[PDB]
């Protein structure tokens, strides 16, 4: 099955999800020079005031932490979208070493590692239907670089020594999700996809601008989980990122100048 190994890695998904090689795949470089201006766009609306996480999971890719859906307890609104989307989950995905890890990718330039925040439109009432829709997701894209900690992750690395393996589990409440938000909202926006399989194009991507800084021994920590399962052999997991794709017919929108 699919991973970022030399024989199941990104270049190898396209037999099994043909969309792989589609006409809004994700992710992108983001030439920001390119990029046009769009001052019609609104300020986006994050309202994670009464997120509800439950679990974190290892699933063998990356780890992700979940949240309750069930409600509009956590959601993103504004910006490029029309209507309400609620929060689902998020994860990350990084590299081996500080130069790489990012999805996204800035005037080619490769972060160690990149946060998606997966919020799904709430006019289509669970996440499965909104994947089928071209318009079905939104994902806020928060870029990581090595620098200061970042105080609001470390719960999230605390608890990963309990999920070293594919397909542990742990309770993961009263996680806040704001605490990995950077000060500014500026983004850029395209129309793209799911950047792992089954690939669809279903998102509405929103790029911060603005990295968040994270420290090496919180970075090193997320190197140190396992993409195998308990009692198979260790690898770690490490590069699971999906490297940028073409942009075709598509122009990527700013929201600053």
Not at 138 to 145: D, E, P, T
């Amino acid at each position: 099955h699919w991973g970022y190994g030399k024989h199941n890695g990104p270049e190898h998904w396209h037999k099994d999800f043909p969309i792989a090689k589609g006409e809004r795949q994700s992710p992108v470089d983001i030439d920001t020079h390119t990029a046009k201006y769009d001052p019609s766009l609104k300020p986006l609306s994050v309202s994670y005031d009464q997120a509800t996480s439950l679990r974190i999971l290892n699933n063998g890719h990356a780890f992700n932490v979940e949240f309750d859906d069930s409600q509009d307890k956590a959601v993103l609104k504004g910006g490029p979208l029309d209507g309400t989307y609620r929060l689902i989950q998020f994860h990350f995905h990084w590299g081996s070493l500080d130069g790489q890890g990012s999805e996204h990718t800035v005037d080619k330039k490769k972060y160690a590692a990149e946060l998606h925040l997966v919020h799904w439109n709430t006019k289509y009432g669970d996440f499965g239907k909104a994947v089928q829709q071209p318009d079905g997701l939104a994902v806020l894209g928060i870029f990581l670089k090595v620098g200061s900690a970042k105080p609001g992750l470390q719960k999230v690395v605390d608890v990963l020594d309990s999920i070293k393996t594919k397909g542990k589990s742990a309770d993961f409440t009263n996680f806040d999700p704001r605490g990995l938000l950077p000060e500014s909202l500026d983004y850029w926006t395209y129309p793209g996809s799911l950047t792992t399989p089954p690939l669809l194009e279903c998102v509405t991507w929103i790029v911060l601008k603005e990295p968040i800084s994270v420290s090496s021994e919180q970075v090193l920590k997320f190197r140190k989980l396992n993409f195998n399962g308990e009692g198979e052999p260790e690898e770690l997991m490490v590069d699971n990122w999906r490297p940028a794709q073409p942009l075709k017919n598509r122009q990527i929108k700013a929201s600053f100048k």
